[PDB]
Amino acid sequence: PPLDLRFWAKERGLRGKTYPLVCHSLDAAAAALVLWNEYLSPGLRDTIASSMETDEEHAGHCIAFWAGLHDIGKLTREFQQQIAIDLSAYPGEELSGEQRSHAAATGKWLPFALPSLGYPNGGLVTGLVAQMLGGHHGTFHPHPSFQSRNPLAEFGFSSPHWEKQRHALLHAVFDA
DNA sequence: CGCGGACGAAGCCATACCATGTGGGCTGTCGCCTGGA
Ligand SMILES: [Fe+3]
């Protein structure tokens, strides 16, 4: 699916301009890498890399992709509808009023989409990383507790259009 | 001297703006008189 550039990532004090979400995800991941090489100490990187059974190369790669996903939860409807943006393109997912923050949205959606990329479904690694970046605003949220065998739809993610776009963004930052 | 009644001693407290649609049940009338049935 062709990725769209209408979705926002930053709106405060832009004098009427909108910033694409994908560019924020990517430049964020880049910040993760450059800080992973220039800022962090080699010994601490030995600590983290050792604790995660991986090496600097793939550990840095992983956390870079994770930073690139920090704000993926912004692809809801209450998030972009905050200002006048045309949403009639993709129907469904009407306003329920859960007041979820984008960080909560990502923290609750990641444990069920990324398994197509290889993380073990229901495992621990995907959980810790999911809540880990999902709490990117200082407050961590609990692990997803669902009672329906279709968790994606019970959390309010039922439109195949929206899900197809966020999967597209996921894959985009994944090969990037 | 023996004692009633009343109080007081604490353990407690609590950084990345908007809405509401409803109802139904009670009252009595004449023209009067003759004729025919
Ligand atoms: Fe964020």
- What is the distance between the alpha carbons of residues A154 and A139, in angstroms, rounded to a whole number? 23
Nucleic strand B near CB of residue A13 (< 7 Å): no
Instruction: Please tell me what resolution, in angstroms, this structure has.
Output: 3.7
Distance A18 CA to ligand 1 centre (A): 16
Nearest nucleotide to the CA of A10, by C1', is B16
Nucleic strand B near CB of residue A137 (< 7 Å): yes
A100 CB contacts (<8 Å, ≥6 apart)?
A73, A76, A78, A108, A156
**Residue A4, exposed/middle/buried by CB under 10 A (0-12, 13-18, 19+)?**
middle
- What is the distance between the alpha carbons of residues A148 and A172, in angstroms, rounded to a whole number? 29
Residues 53-112 of A with CB under 7 A from strand B: 71, 101
**Rounded to whole angstroms, what are the CA distances from A118 to A82, A93, A115?**
34, 28, 5
CATH class assigned to A8-176: mainly alpha
Residue A38 per-residue DSSP state: I
**Residue A149, exposed/middle/buried by CB under 10 A (0-12, 13-18, 19+)?**
exposed
